[PDB]
Amino acid sequence: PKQTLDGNTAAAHVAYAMSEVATIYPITPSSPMAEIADEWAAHGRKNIFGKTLQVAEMQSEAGAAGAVHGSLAAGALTTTFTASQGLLLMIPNMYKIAGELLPCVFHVAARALSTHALSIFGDHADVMAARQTGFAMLSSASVQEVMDLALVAHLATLKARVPFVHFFDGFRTSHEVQKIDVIEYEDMAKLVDWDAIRAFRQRALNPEHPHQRGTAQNPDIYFQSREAANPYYLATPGIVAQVMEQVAGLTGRHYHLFDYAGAPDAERVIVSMGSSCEVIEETVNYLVEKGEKVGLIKVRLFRPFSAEHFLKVLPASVKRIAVLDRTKEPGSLGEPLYEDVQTVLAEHGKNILVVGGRYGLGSKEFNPSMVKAVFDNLAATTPKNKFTVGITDDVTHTSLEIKEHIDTSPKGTFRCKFFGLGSDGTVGANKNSIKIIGDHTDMYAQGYFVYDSKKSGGVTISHLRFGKQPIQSAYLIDQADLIACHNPSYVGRYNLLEGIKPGGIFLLNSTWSAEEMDSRLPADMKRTIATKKLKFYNIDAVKIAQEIGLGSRINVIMQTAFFKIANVIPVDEAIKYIKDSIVKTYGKKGDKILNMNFAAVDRALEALEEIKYPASWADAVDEAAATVTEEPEFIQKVLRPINALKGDELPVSTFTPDGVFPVGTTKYEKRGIAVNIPQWQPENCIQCNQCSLVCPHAAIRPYLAKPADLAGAPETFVTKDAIGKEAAGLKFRIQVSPLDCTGCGNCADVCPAKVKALTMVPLEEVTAVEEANYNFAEQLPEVKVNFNPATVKGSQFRQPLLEFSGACAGCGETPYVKLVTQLFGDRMIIANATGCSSIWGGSAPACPYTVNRQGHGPAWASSLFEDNAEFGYGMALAVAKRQDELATAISKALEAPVSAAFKAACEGWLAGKDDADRSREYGDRIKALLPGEISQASGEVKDLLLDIDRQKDYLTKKSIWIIGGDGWAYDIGYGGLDHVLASGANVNVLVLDTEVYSNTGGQSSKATQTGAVARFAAGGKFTKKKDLGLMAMSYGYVYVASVAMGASHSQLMKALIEAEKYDGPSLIIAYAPCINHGINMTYSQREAKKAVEAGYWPLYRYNPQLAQEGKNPFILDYKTPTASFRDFLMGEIRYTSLKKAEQLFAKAEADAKARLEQYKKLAE
Amino acid sequence: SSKATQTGAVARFAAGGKFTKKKDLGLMAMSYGYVYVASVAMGASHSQLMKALIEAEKYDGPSLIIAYAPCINHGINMTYSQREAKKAVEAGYWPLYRYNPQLAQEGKNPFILDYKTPTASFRDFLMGEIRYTSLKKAEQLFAKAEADAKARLEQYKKLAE
C-alpha cells in the first residue's frame, strides 16, 4: 500500500517485522525508530513470528550493544537503532557480534560525530568509524530505499551470518516524509529463509547442547582462527545480490551492489553513497538530456566491497571519476570511499583519473548546482583533488566554485515553503497536507522540515513537493511556486520571497489591509511581488480563531488557505479531506471542539482576499538604514548573519580552528518573543527579589541606585525607598527586560505580596516604555551593598551570570544554574553534560553565560554525554596543578628582595590558598602590588615577578561544578559519577532531574517514577525510580542533598552553600519541572511545591561534616506532607494518559510512603 | 587497585596505599528493595553459602552474590586459602548477610545478618597477608580501616534491629 512515512518509520516497519527483541537507547535522529517500535508493541502489532516485539531500554548504547550480543548468542533475532555518539559506544560489541557470525541488523540514521563541536545532523562520520568492525554496510538513498534495503539487510544477514549496518542519512532521509510503497509483513515472511532461522536457533547457548564461545587465544591459533571466517565474507556479496533479486521480483524495484545511472558512453562519473545519489541522478538526467556524457555509480553495499560488482556497472568509456565522501578524516590521504575506488581501479589496471571530495557534513546542503560543480571539475584540464563542495574555503582553497545555478527539478513538480512559529501547528498541518495529497492522488509527495535551536518562539521552514514523477530532490526548495508566511513578524526579518518563481503565490497571515501594505511591507519585498507579478493573498487567521473560540490556533485556518489557492487538487475535494481529518483529530474532543474547527475551515475560505497591488511597487526604494550601533566584531560578522539565516555564506576563515566561542553573547539577541510581560507595581512590592530568583531567563532583576545616579532616568522609571539597614539611603526597583522576557508568567505566580506586585500585560502595549526603562536600569553603576549572599533577597542583588538562554518558557532547570552563578560564578568552571543544559547553555553562536564588570564569569565546556563526571574530575586535577605551579613561584618570591607589603600578601595567600574567601582577599592584594613591584625590580627578580603575574588568574580558588541531567546521572554517566564521587575530589555535581530524557523529546529514564508514561514506556514504567541520592550516601564521605526551588527557597540555599564549602564530593539532585510532564509552564514553580507537599519528591541533606561533629548526618527537611499523592499525579499529562492504570497509581503511592518512612528512620 | 580494594591495602596503582575505603556494592543494590543481595565466604561458613545460593536462584528477580575469593595477589599461603576466608569473617573484615525481598512481602524484615559478633582481632588479620605488610603512615591507615569496619557492622546491626 502507499503511505506517507519518513525514513525512520520506514526502517522501523521492516525492523519490527523481522525481529523478536529490540534493545534501544535514544539518540537524535535515530530515536523516532525506537519510539514507534514501542508504540506498535504497546498496541500489539505482530511480527512475522506472530508475536509482539520486545523493546528493552538500556542505560547506554554500550549496554544496548551487549544486550544485542547476549540476545543473539542465546537464540533470539535482535535489532537496535542508534547513530553518531551512540554507534561509537557499540563499536566494541560490533567486533564481537561480527566475529561470532551472528545475524543482526543495526539501523543507523547517520549523524556527525562530536569533534570541535556537537552536531545532531547528518553525515557518514559515525558509520565510517565502524567500517573495520566486520559488519556489512548497506546504504539507502531515499525513504523508499530505506523500506526496501532494510528488508534486504534483514534477509541477507540470516543467509550470510554476517551482521549488517543499514544506514541512511540523518534528517535528510530519516526525517524526510515521502509517499512510498510499503511492503506488507505477509510478503516479507514469504521471502525469509526459515531454514536459516532454525540453524541460528541451534547455535544458541543452551544447557542441553552446550558450547563455549568467546575464548581467549594465544598467538599459536589466533591468526588462523581469525581467517577462518573468510568464506562467509567472500559469499556475502552474492548473497546480498540474490536477496536483492527476491525483493526485485516482489516490488519491481531493482537494486544491485552498485547501481549505475547516466549515459552509457559517459566519460565523467561520480561515485557516491546515501541520499546524495538522489540529487546526483536528478542532475545526471538534466545533464545527459543536454548532451553531457556523465553518469553516476550508487554504492549500496559498502562493505564487503565487491570488486566484481563495482566493475560490472562501470562503463568502459569512463575516463575521469569524482568520489564524494560525506565524512572527513583529518590528515588522512583521502576519505574512505575515495581510497576504495582508487584501490580497486588500481588492482585492475584501469587508467582512470580519480578525484575525491567531501560534501554535506552535518546536513550541509548538497543541491544539483553543486553536483554540476563536481562534474565541471572533472571537465577541467587539471581536476582539483581533495576538494570540498558547499562551503567557501578561503583558507586552504579546497572548495569548488559554484559558477551558475541550474534548475533540475522535473517539470510538473509543485514546490512550497512554509515559514512558521514554534509549535503553532504549521509543521503538523503540512504533514497532514502531504498525507492528504498522497492518499487521494497519483502524485508523489515529499516533506522536509527545518527547525530552530531556540526551544520556544523559534522559526520553522517547511519544504513540500508534489509531482507526477518520483521526487529525487533531497535538498531544500530552490524555486517555489508558493511561499506561505504564517507569522507576520517575519516580514522584514527573513528573506521570505527568496527564489520564488515568476507568477508564484505569496500567502501571508496578517491583520494588515491592502492600503497598509504600502507602509508595512519592505521595499525589497514589494519589488519582488511586483516585478515577478506574484498572486499576493492575505488572511487574518488570528481574528478568525478568536471569534470562533479556537484562541490563537491558526493551523487549521492556514491549511485551508493553502489548498484554496495552491491548485494542487480541486478546492472542493480538499475541503472534504480537511474536514475528514478534523473528525479524525477532534472527534474525541467533543461536539463543541469539532464544530469550531469546521467553522474555521468555512470562515477561512471566505476571508482569504487577494491583494491588488499597484505596478509602481516594482520601483520602490529601500528606506535609509539607521546609524548602526558599534557592536563587537564577532556579533557583527558571526552572530547577526547566523540569526539572519545566512550562516551558510560565512567562509572558513570566519571560525576558530577549535570551536572556541566568546561568552555573554545572548544579550545581543533581543528576540522579543513574549506575548505578555510583567509590569511592576511599586506600591505592592515588598522588595523580596523572589521574582528575580525564579526567572528561567534572567529577564527580571532588582536594581539599586544612589539618588544621584537616577538623574537621566525616563519618567516611567519609578523607584521606591530601599528596605533594610544594608541598603539605607538607596532606591529600589524591579525592572524587566521586555525583549528578553518569554511571557512564561512564573514571576507573577511567585510574587507573595498581599496585592500582586506583578501583572501580565501585553508586550506591544508597554514595549516602547519598558525598553527605555531597561536600557536605563542596565546602565546603572555598581552599588556596593552588604546584603548577606546566603539569603534569597541578598543573592539576587548579585549579577546573574546565566541570562537569556534558549530553554523553554518556564523551564525548571535554568533557575537552579542561574542561582549558582550568583553565589560562586566569579570563580567557577562548568563541565556540562550533553542534554538540555548543553543545548540552552551552549548552542552556537550564542552563549548565555556572561561576565561581570571585571570580566570574570564561568568558563563552560561540554565533552560528551557519558563522560561528564570524569570530564570535570580532570578539570579539578589540572586546576590543582596550576595552583601548585603558582604556589612554587610565590614561595620563591619570599626569598627575593621584594617589598614588605608584597611578602605579607604572599604569606597570607600561601596559608589560605585552599579557602574561597581568603584566597580571593590575599589574591587581590597581590594583584594590586604586582605592577608596582615589577617596576621596582630588574634582572632575575623581575622575571620571578613576571611569572607570578602570568599566573595571577589562579590566585583565587576555583569551584568545579559538574552539571548534567538525570539521564546522564542515573543511566549513561552513572558509572563515571559513581567513580568521581567515590574519589573524594572537591567537585560539586548538580543533577537537573526532569525524570525523562528531556532534550530528545521525553524518553524513559531510571529517574522516571512508577506508572509514569514517557517515550519508550508507552504502557508506563513498572519498576520504581532509582534512588541516586541514597547510593551516593552509602560512601558516607559524599555530601548528598535533594532540593526543589518551587517547594522551598531556603532549603535550596542551605544545601547549595553547604555543598560548595564541603571539602569533598557534593551531589545536588534538583527537581526540575519540564514541558514533557504535560503541565502548564506558567505555574512551573507551583508544580514543584505540590510535588514535595504530596510526598512525590523528598527534601533532605546528608552532611558528612555533621558526622565528624558527633551529630546525625541525615537531616530530613520536610517530614510531614500535607497534599494528596493521587491528586498530584492527575495534574500532569504524563500520568493521566495511562488512564491496568489504577494498579500502577497504587504502587507509586506505596513507594512514596516507604521512601518517606525510610528517611524518618535514618533521621531518628 | 579497584574500588573493591580495602583501606590500607597495597597493590599496583596504589604504591602509597589506598586512602578511600571499600565501595559498598551490596548496600547500593539493597536500595532497590527488589534485588536479592548476599555476601558469602566459603571458608567462613559452609551452611551460609548453601542457603544464599539456593535462595538467590529460586528468587524470581535479580539476585546479587558478592563472594570473597582469596587470591595469590593477597600474598598468603594458598594451602590455607579456605582458612584465610574464615579468618577474614572472624575478624570483621568481610560481612555475611542475606537481603531477601520475599521476606518484605511477607511482612518480615528483608535483611538478615548471618554473623553478628566477631571473635577475632581485626589488626592481626591485616598482618597475616603480604598485601598489607608491604605498606609497613601505615598505622594511620590501619586505624581508619578498623573504624570503617566497625561502622559497617554497626550499620548492619541497625538494619537488623
Ligand SMILES: Cc1ncc(C[n+]2c([C@@](C)(O)C(=O)O)sc(CCOP(=O)(O)OP(=O)(O)O)c2C)c(N)n1
Ligand atoms: C552517547 C550519547 N548517546 C545519546 C546522545 C543523545 N542525547 C542528547 C543530544 C543533545 O546529544 C541529542 O539530543 O542529540 S541529549 C540526551 C538526553 C538528555 O537527558 P538528560 O536528563 O541527561 O538532560 P535533560 O535534557 O536536561 O533532560 C541524549 C540521549 C548523546 N548526545 N550521546
Ligand code: SF4
Ligand atoms: S514572565 Fe517569565 S521570562 Fe518574563 S520576567 Fe517573568 S519569569 Fe522571567
Ligand code: SF4
Ligand atoms: S516577587 Fe513581587 S514583591 Fe517580591 S520583589 Fe518581585 S515584584 Fe516585588
Ligand code: SF4
Ligand atoms: S528541561 Fe524541559 S523546559 Fe527546560 S529547556 Fe529542556 S525541554 Fe524545555
Ligand code: SF4
Ligand atoms: S588465585 Fe590465581 S586464578 Fe584465583 S583470582 Fe588470584 S590470580 Fe586469579
Ligand SMILES: [Mg+2]
Ligand atoms: Mg532529564
